[PDB]
């Protein structure tokens, strides 16, 4: 093999604290929070402006009404490029963060994120073999090191794998199978752990078009699918007008501008959100496969001013409430994308520097959406 085996201590299978099926575990999660721009940051945990994950942050996330965290994690930059050995200090750091989250009674989804793109931007026949070898080596290590956590810990094999056609989807299916095999090979509680597999680009329409099967699993009923959501992009993330379209500042029936109508959406309103989520209910949920809505948020436009800003913030809160509520009604588990920022074009709802709530308006909307307030 390209790399040595990192399945060095496989353990007898253990179902202790692993008694929930995927469907049962999904029923315990109504609202999640991503620790964005932190453990996945290129250059290190603080490189993208957030503090190291703290117990105080995880206590505040739980106390604020979240049931779960999604923890984007980088790995490649911590690995020896000859051996694929991940730094012991980094594996211990991730284990410490998982332990703190579980100490605060959160469910935890750990992934390999974009991670500088080694996998994510390389869903190609040319990279298939070398990426399967690194996927296997990395997951053997991650799974071995985190093997003793109970079913509060879930694994997600990839983030937003760039598969745009059937040929790339076949490569992605292989990367997902490698993930499952590697985790299961380590035994112990990893014989039973719920694993989460990503649709192509985590895009609902591409998933609907290209996805055909889950990986084979030695476990039964321990898999979930994952999609993300930024629809409509013009509202949620777009930071400048383009030749092909304009930023929307406003979203939601009864949160639309009567004055600057050109900043209201021309597509991607409530009916489209329902339509897209129904595709996933049809394909996955109503076939007994829960869906993790692993990443969604519409960024704050604090570069607006006055009545326009007020109207923007009211429709942004409504967008988050609507997405959360409509996801849950259709069996998608909503995980809010928080990049930690509190300035323009950001998504942090907490002030991470001081462990306080920065944006109670969006927090309230998420909790109302979840039926929590």
Numbering used by the authors: 24 to 396
Paper text:
Cellvibrio japonicus is a saprotrophic bacterium which possesses the remarkable ability to grow in isolation using a variety of hemicellulosic polysaccharides as sole carbon sources. It produces a diverse collection of GHs, assembling enzyme systems that can degrade cellulose, xylans, mannans, and xyloglucans, among others. Effective xyloglucan-degrading GH systems (recently reviewed by Attia and Brumer) contain exo-acting glycosidases acting as debranching accessory enzymes and endo-acting enzymes (xyloglucanases) that generate short, branched β-(1,4)-glucan oligomers (xyloglucan oligosaccharides).18−23Exo-acting enzymes are expected to address each of the glycosidic linkages reported in xyloglucan branches, though the reported enzyme diversity falls short of reported branch diversity. The work presented here comprises the design and validation of trisaccharidic xyloglucan (“XyG”)-type cyclophellitol probes and their validation as bona fide, predictive tools for the identification of xyloglucanase activities and their discrimination from cellulase activities within a xyloglucan-elicited C. japonicus degradome.
Recombinant production and characterization of homology-selected putative xyloglucanases in the C. japonicus genome identified Cel5D, Cel5E, Cel5F, and CjGH74A as specific xyloglucanases, but the roles of each of these remain unclear. In order to validate the ABP-XyG probes for profiling xyloglucanases in complex biological samples, we first established the potency and mode of action of ABP-XyG-N3 as inhibitor of various previously characterized recombinant xyloglucanases. Incubation of pure recombinant Bacteroides ovatus BoGH5A,13Paenibacillus pabuli PpXG5,19 and C. japonicus CjCel5D with 100 μM ABP-XyG-N3 for 1 h under optimal activity conditions gave near-quantitative labeling as assessed by intact protein mass spectrometry analysis, while identical treatment with ABP-Cel-N3 gave minimal labeling. X-ray diffraction data of the complex between CjCel5D and ABP-XyG-N3 shows near-perfect mimicry of the known glycosyl enzyme intermediate state in the −1 and −2 subsites. Irreversible inhibition kinetics, measured using bespoke 4-methylumbelliferyl (4MU) and 6-chloro-4-methylumbelliferyl (6C4MU) XXXG fluorogenic substrates (see the Supporting Information for synthetic details and Tuomivaara et al. for oligosaccharide nomenclature), showed probe selectivity values ((ki,XyG-N3/KI,XyG-N3)/(ki,Cel-N3/KI,Cel-N3)) ranging from >17 for CjCel5D to 0.13 and <0.0026 for HiCel7B49 and BaCel5A,50 two well-known cellulases, respectively. We observed strong and uniquely xyloglucan-induced production of a ∼65 kDa ABP-XyG-Cy5-selective outer membrane-associated enzyme. Pulldowns from saturation cultures using ABP-βGlc-Bio, ABP-Cel-Bio, and ABP-XyG-Bio unambiguously identified Cel5D as the only exclusively ABP-XyG-Bio-reactive band, Cel5C as the exclusively ABP-Cel-Bio-reactive band, and Cel3A, Cel3B, and Cel3D as the ABP-βGlc-reactive bands.
